[PDB]
Design a protein around this nucleic acid. Sequence first.
RNA 1: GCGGGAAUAGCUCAGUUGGUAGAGCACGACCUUGCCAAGGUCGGGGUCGCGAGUUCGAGUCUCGUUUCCCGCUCCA
RNA 2: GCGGGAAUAGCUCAGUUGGUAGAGCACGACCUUGCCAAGGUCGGGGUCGCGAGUUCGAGUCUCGUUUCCCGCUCCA
RNA 3: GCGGGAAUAGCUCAGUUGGUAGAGCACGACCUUAAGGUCGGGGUCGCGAGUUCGAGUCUCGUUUCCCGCUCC
RNA 4: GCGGGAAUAGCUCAGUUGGUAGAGCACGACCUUAAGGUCGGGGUCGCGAGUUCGAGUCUCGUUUCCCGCUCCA
Lengths: 159, 158, 159, 158
Amino acid sequence: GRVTAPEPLSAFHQVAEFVSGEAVLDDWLKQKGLKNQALGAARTFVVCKKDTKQVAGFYSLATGSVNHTEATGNLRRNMPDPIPVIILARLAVDLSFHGKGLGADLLHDAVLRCYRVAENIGVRAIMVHALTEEAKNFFIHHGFKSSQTQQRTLFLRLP
Amino acid sequence: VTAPEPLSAFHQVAEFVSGEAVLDDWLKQKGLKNQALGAARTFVVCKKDTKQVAGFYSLATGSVNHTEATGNLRRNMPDPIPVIILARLAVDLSFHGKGLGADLLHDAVLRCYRVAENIGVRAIMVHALTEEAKNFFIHHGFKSSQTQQRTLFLRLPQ
Amino acid sequence: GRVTAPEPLSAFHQVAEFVSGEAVLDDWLKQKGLKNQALGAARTFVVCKKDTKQVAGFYSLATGSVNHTEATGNLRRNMPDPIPVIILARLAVDLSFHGKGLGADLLHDAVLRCYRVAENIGVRAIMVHALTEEAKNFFIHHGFKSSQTQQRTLFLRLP
Amino acid sequence: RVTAPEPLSAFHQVAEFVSGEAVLDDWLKQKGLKNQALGAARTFVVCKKDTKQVAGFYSLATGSVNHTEATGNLRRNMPDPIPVIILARLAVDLSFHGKGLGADLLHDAVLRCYRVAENIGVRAIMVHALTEEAKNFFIHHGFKSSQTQQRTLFLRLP
RNA sequence: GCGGGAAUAGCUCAGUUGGUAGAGCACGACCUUGCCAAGGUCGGGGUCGCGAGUUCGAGUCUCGUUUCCCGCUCCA
RNA sequence: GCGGGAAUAGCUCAGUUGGUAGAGCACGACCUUGCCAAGGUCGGGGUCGCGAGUUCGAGUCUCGUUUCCCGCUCCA
RNA sequence: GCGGGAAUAGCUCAGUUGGUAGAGCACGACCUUAAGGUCGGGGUCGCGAGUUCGAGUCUCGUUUCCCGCUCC
RNA sequence: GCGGGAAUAGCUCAGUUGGUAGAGCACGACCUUAAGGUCGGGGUCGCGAGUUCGAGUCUCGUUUCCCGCUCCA
Ligand SMILES: [Ca+2]
Ligand SMILES: [Ca+2]
Ligand SMILES: [Ca+2]
Ligand SMILES: [Ca+2]
Ligand SMILES: [Ca+2]
Ligand SMILES: [Ca+2]
Ligand SMILES: [Ca+2]
Ligand SMILES: [Ca+2]
Ligand SMILES: [Ca+2]
Ligand SMILES: [Ca+2]
Ligand SMILES: [Ca+2]
Ligand SMILES: [Ca+2]
Ligand SMILES: [Ca+2]
Ligand SMILES: [Ca+2]
Ligand SMILES: [Ca+2]
Ligand SMILES: [Ca+2]
Ligand SMILES: [Ca+2]
Ligand SMILES: [Ca+2]
Ligand SMILES: [Ca+2]
Ligand SMILES: [Ca+2]
Ligand SMILES: [Ca+2]
Ligand SMILES: [Ca+2]
Ligand SMILES: [Ca+2]
Ligand SMILES: [Ca+2]
Ligand SMILES: [Ca+2]
Ligand SMILES: [Ca+2]
Ligand SMILES: [Ca+2]
Ligand SMILES: [Ca+2]
Ligand SMILES: [Ca+2]
Ligand SMILES: [Ca+2]
Ligand SMILES: [Ca+2]
Ligand SMILES: [Ca+2]
Ligand SMILES: [Ca+2]
Ligand SMILES: [Ca+2]
Ligand SMILES: [Ca+2]
Ligand SMILES: [Ca+2]
Ligand SMILES: [Ca+2]
Ligand SMILES: [Ca+2]
Ligand SMILES: [Ca+2]
Ligand SMILES: [Ca+2]
Ligand SMILES: [Ca+2]
């Protein structure tokens, strides 16, 4: 049983029953996702359970900057300071749907959206802070490369 | 002039002059290189039926801390605040007064609205290079920071 | 099973019952071992089943020389031509005793004997002709190093 | 009169050695000790009664000779090549000629070769005679010249 | 932009010297009793990134070009 | 003997323009629900062979010295 | 491994159809003008067995050395 | 989210014990040297409802904007 294609979070999605195992991700979804969509703090995208409005996973994007000091030499080569980036702020899949490949589908939609964004505005890389080791390996397998200074911070270059 | 289009190796930037040399040399030296590195997106309007650039603006993702941000900008916001930086905006002196600067800024602001549908963006932010530049941006809605007086913001009505 | 320490082949040792899996080696023992010991073509040393004359393993030594062309530059540095060597001509273990580590013990006795001999007469290295590739790996594992020309010819320099 | 044979070392004084054959003497002085270290030869010297001045020496090294240069006596029922010990060097300082020192050196060498042939296959001792005096000397002590190379002689070991 | 390093088999690499193409893993087949695991062998796959040059001879030396990596430079 | 190269963690190795040390394997602990083989993580681990010298500052440059390697030379 | 030869005086060798072991050299001595010659001594025929009236000699076995070929 | 403020003429604002809607700037004509002066025009008091004899004013609901704090490992 798969799920729908990603769609912007709205006031109609039921997020109350969402649990990812990571308290920060779940609490963020339930408390601030929609409010931020209104506030311009982030853009959230959800996939729902087949033919429901119950969210099975989500990712959130926001513009960002990384200082040269906290960036790897590869990233900062011939770049302004700070370096322009897009922050993959949140990426979480309900535990009930782990293994069905929802995280990989979400990350794929996110990367595509970041490409489309980069056509219009300067973006050196996508940046994520992995919350767990499972998360780090997830991102490393899908092309991301950990930092040298902060080893749980990963980047993916776009061009 | 032409309608806005991405910078490419084909645009004539060698004779571009805006009165701020930093902007002109930025165009000529880094516009395209940054286009390649993903440090900025530059858009130019040209002298009709030429590849001669008459004006441009550059966009880049960014963030501003709550301390350098106005309270309207940081209201109920994470830290830092996600923004799009109007990194560069210049018009050749040959085209001053025709209202081209406002057209450039407008195209840029629209592009940021379209972007804000896909990614979190609280405001457009610019570092005004002169007092004229600061006044221009204030005339088009921007509001100076309280801390840094040449940093101005323009909020995006979602 | 358990065997005595190595001793010269003689007319008292039962070599008719030797089987090692290698037909050349077994036929060599049975046909030429004792006569060559008499003729000085080789010196053979055997280990027997403690309290038997049944040969469980043997090695045969004989002087030799190798030309600069088949010698590695390490071997030939500042050396006459040919190079003086001692030839590990034969080394085989009876099938009843494989796995008991007897081949390595024999090789150890042989190397010791060559050291004692090099005390009296110039010897640059021990040289052996590996009969199998497994044998080559055995000798490489115990310190031997293949030549550049023939990889089944291996040397061991003496201290 | 001299000491009993002993291995060459950095302590033996060989600069004053003269045997009449310059090749042998220069070999002693230039290569004896280095070859002792390299495993190219094992050298043994007899000294001048409580000195480190060498009066004579012989050098041994393993070797093999092909059947073509072997006498039929040497190759009878033998592999090819034939394993031998090479008496590479044997020389007496002229100051001790006639005293029978060469025979004593050869005898010590032959004994050492017996003791070696106990441990490793050795068909014969082989020497390359440099002069006719030398060839006849080796022939007098039992050696037998080759059929092909007339300056190469063999001595079989019982 | 300046400097340095890299590019050799599907992957990871070795190749000091200017002198016949390499190893481990992967793949096809075979060997060990008929399958076969471990060990071994055979085979496919390389204009040694590409191109030009010196030499009797180039992975090796020379030059041009492509790409990647690492340090520094830098646009608030 | 002439020439070239090397020595950096228990092992195999990187280390840039002279600006205060790193990787893989190995080791101790943890994850794998626990334990266990594989995999992943965290962590500890160096007079950069030795000595001297230059320098504000040495893994880096100079010299000496110990050891090893590669090419050539060479004693039928 | 196959094949062939040798063993007799200190040395080199002879010893036909089986009948006490021969010649030169060498060695000791002598003759005279170191040489040549003469004189003198030494075997038991590698070993063992057998045939024979009788064996250096023939039969068989064996020891040692040598030569050609074979060969890992 | 907690707290505070704003909305009345084109603009800046007043209209406190609740009574046809007020001043300045600005706008049109005119006086004179385009500033000053004179004259003239413009609302329906953010919206809706309620109390009141009567609501710009009081009560409640609501719309938009603004300020301070809070905040997203
Ligand atoms: Ca659930
Ligand atoms: Ca112009
Ligand atoms: Ca058996
Ligand atoms: Ca002298
Ligand atoms: Ca470069
Ligand atoms: Ca590759
Ligand atoms: Ca390489
Ligand atoms: Ca080569
Ligand atoms: Ca078969
Ligand atoms: Ca192949
Ligand atoms: Ca090809
Ligand atoms: Ca090429
Ligand atoms: Ca390639
Ligand atoms: Ca190619
Ligand atoms: Ca040519
Ligand atoms: Ca080549
Ligand atoms: Ca190049
Ligand atoms: Ca080491
Ligand atoms: Ca190194
Ligand atoms: Ca340092
Ligand atoms: Ca020092
Ligand atoms: Ca450094
Ligand atoms: Ca040095
Ligand atoms: Ca015979
Ligand atoms: Ca006799
Ligand atoms: Ca005789
Ligand atoms: Ca005869
Ligand atoms: Ca006479
Ligand atoms: Ca007589
Ligand atoms: Ca007798
Ligand atoms: Ca008779
Ligand atoms: Ca409020
Ligand atoms: Ca109004
Ligand atoms: Ca107003
Ligand atoms: Ca007011
Ligand atoms: Ca009223
Ligand atoms: Ca006016
Ligand atoms: Ca007035
Ligand atoms: Ca109204
Ligand atoms: Ca009423
Ligand atoms: Ca109210």
